[PDB]
Every structure is written in structure tokens, then in C-alpha cells.
């Protein structure tokens, strides 16, 4: 009906101000939370995302390793085995008195948010890089795995006579 | 792969303390063992976890042993030491799983979920088709196509 350009009361309605915060009650901030992962510490970002492995992934991996074996490409196998050798050493037994810290308990008001926060922060700090309990480096001796690719069965031509 | 939603990471203690529900579930354990076997490396950490966990679930129902009470605290210290050692072994197994899964996905050209790292060709972390217009960890915008970690031809 030829909408007039002059709205009398429609404009004068005290427009709602923009939301300030987020989350619960629109008051959460944008602080970097504990969910942030560290992509520098180790090949896997700490607090790893929940990756789930499927049987179709297993079948694809079987096909890939079949193709690699049939084509003679063994660099991937060697790098995988070296990575496993480096990361899969037996953890040394902790000495007496080694215990992960526990959060103090109070009965009047247990703050579950702080209870989970302490655990998350502690485990975030406990990166695989500084896992002194797990032996690592070249100084360790591993009498369970082949040390070099030369002695692996794919290099069987060398060991003769 | 099929899970492309941004995910929340639970502490390794929270993962381990779960009994034969997800962490110690036989289906997931045998899937991990199959993956390790197909890769050709030994399953020593997985077996060390399984031997502990089967006994733990076997003895979960019974009562704790009666104790006179050690004056020196040696028994309590030894129990804590054993618990910590088992927890660290399971930590090593958890890290091994979460490392080799990423390595296998990188080899198989499988695009992982949001905000995760694959040591091959994606070190910053993969973000694609997320509800937020930015990486949410670098606060940097991303192109409309998610990303191309791998080539086109197979």
C-alpha cells in the first residue's frame, strides 16, 4: 500500500544491543581455553583429538602395504619401524614416592570445574617430549629391535656365506 | 575420516580410567592390534596393556586385601608405585595408538577431523568445513575448499 518512508512507532522501539559474550548466559569470553592443542610438541599434538580407526581404513592400509611390498618401496616401512623403535621402549619402573598429584578435597563446596581444570592443565603440561620415564634417544640400548635397516629381512642379499 | 566435526580432547587419565568400555574394549583393542600387525611392528605396548587390563577386570569385583597396617608406609608406597607404573605403560600405549593412527591416515591420504596434526604435510593442524570461519587456534581464515593435503591422482 505504498509503504510510507515515515514509520512513527516502529522505529522508536529501543533496539536490542548486540550480544557481548558467548556460551552460558551470553557471558563467556574468547580466552584461549584448555582445548587448545600444541602442534609443536611431538609429531602428535598434545591432548590428541579422538581419532577412531575403521575396518575400511584397515583394508586400505592392507592394500597400500601390499602395493608397497610388490613395488619394492621400503622407505615407508623403514621409517615406520624406526619410529616404533623410538617410541615403543619399555617404561622404567618409578622409584618409591613417585605419584601423580591429586586435587585437594573439600566437603562444603566441591568445585568440579576446578577439579577438571587442574587435571587438564597437568596433563597438558605433561607432554610426551618430557616423559623422562620412557627411555629415549640414542644412548639407550634396545635388545629387542633391529638397530639399522641393513639387518632387516628386506636386505637379505647381504648376509651370505 | 567420517568424523569431521571439531572435537574435545579428554585427559589421558580420563581415557585410561575408563574400564572395558572404550579404552579396554576388545573391539578397539583388536582393531589396533590388526593395524600394528599390518604395519609389521611388534605389539609390545598393546600386549603389556592387555595383560594388565584383563587381570584388572578379573579382580575388579572382589574386595581389597586385609592389611595389618604398615608403620613404615612401604606397602602403600609400593602400591602407589605399581599403580603409577601401570598408568605410565597405558600412557605409552595411548600415545602409540594416537601416533600410529595419524601416521596411517597420512599414508592412506585420509583427511582427519578438525584441529588435528598429521606429521606428514600438515603440521599446523587440519581445519576444514568448520562451524567457525577461522582455524579457531590460529584465528586465521581458511579457503572455501577445506585443503589439499595430498595430490589428486591416486
Amino acid at each position: 500500500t505504498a509503504t510510507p518512508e515515515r514509520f512513527s512507532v516502529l522505529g522508536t522501539t529501543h533496539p536490542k544491543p548486540k550480544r557481548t559474550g558467548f556460551g552460558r548466559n551470553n557471558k563467556m569470553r574468547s580466552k584461549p581455553s584448555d582445548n587448545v592443542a600444541w602442534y609443536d610438541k611431538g609429531p602428535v599434538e598434545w591432548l590428541p583429538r579422538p581419532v577412531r580407526l575403521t575396518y575400511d581404513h584397515l583394508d586400505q592400509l592392507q592394500q597400500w602395504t601390499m602395493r608397497a611390498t610388490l613395488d619394492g618401496r621400503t622407505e615407508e616401512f623403514n621409517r615406520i619401524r624406526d619410529l616404533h623403535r623410538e617410541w615403543s621402549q619399555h617404561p622404567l619402573m618409578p622409584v618409591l614416592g613417585d605419584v601423580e598429584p591429586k586435587f585437594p578435597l573439600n566437603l562444603f563446596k566441591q568445585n568440579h570445574r576446578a577439579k577438571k581444570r587442574f587435571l587438564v592443565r597437568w596433563h597438558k603440561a605433561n607432554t610426551p617430549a618430557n616423559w623422562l620415564w620412557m627411555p629415549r634417544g640414542p644412548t639407550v640400548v634396545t635388545p629387542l629391535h633391529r638397530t639399522n635397516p641393513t639387518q632387516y629381512p628386506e636386505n637379505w642379499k647381504q648376509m651370505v656365506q | 575420516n567420517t568424523f569431521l566435526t571439531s572435537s574435545v580432547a579428554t585427559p589421558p587419565i580420563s581415557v585410561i580410567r575408563t574400564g572395558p568400555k572404550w579404552w579396554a574394549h576388545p573391539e578397539r583393542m583388536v582393531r589396533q592390534k590388526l593395524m600394528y600387525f599390518t604395519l609389521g611392528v611388534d605389539q609390545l605396548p598393546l600386549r603389556r596393556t592387555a595383560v594388565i587390563q584383563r587381570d584388572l577386570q578379573r579382580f575388579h569385583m572382589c574386595k581389597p586385601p586385609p592389611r595389618v597396617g604398615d608403620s613404615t608406609g612401604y606397602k602403600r608406597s609400593r602400591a602407589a608405585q605399581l599403580n603409577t607404573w601401570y598408568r605410565r605403560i597405558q600412557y605409552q600405549e595411548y600415545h602409540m595408538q594416537h601416533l600410529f593412527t595419524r601416521h596411517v591416515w597420512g599414508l592412506l591420504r585420509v583427511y582427519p577431523g578438525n584441529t588435528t596434526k598429521i606429521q606428514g604435510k600438515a603440521d599446523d593442524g587440519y581445519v576444514g568445513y568448520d562451524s567457525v570461519p577461522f582455524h579457531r587456534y590460529n584465528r586465521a581464515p581458511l579457503p572455501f575448499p577445506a585443503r589439499e593435503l595430498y595430490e589428486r591422482r591416486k
Binding site: 619402573m93 | 587381570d55 605399581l82 601401570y86
Partner: peptide, 7 residues
């Protein structure tokens, strides 16, 4: 005691 290792 579930698992005990010599080394």
C-alpha cells in the same frame, strides 16, 4: 601384581 618385568 598383574605384570612384572625383569628390566
Amino acid at each position: 601384581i598383574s605384570y612384572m618385568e625383569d628390566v
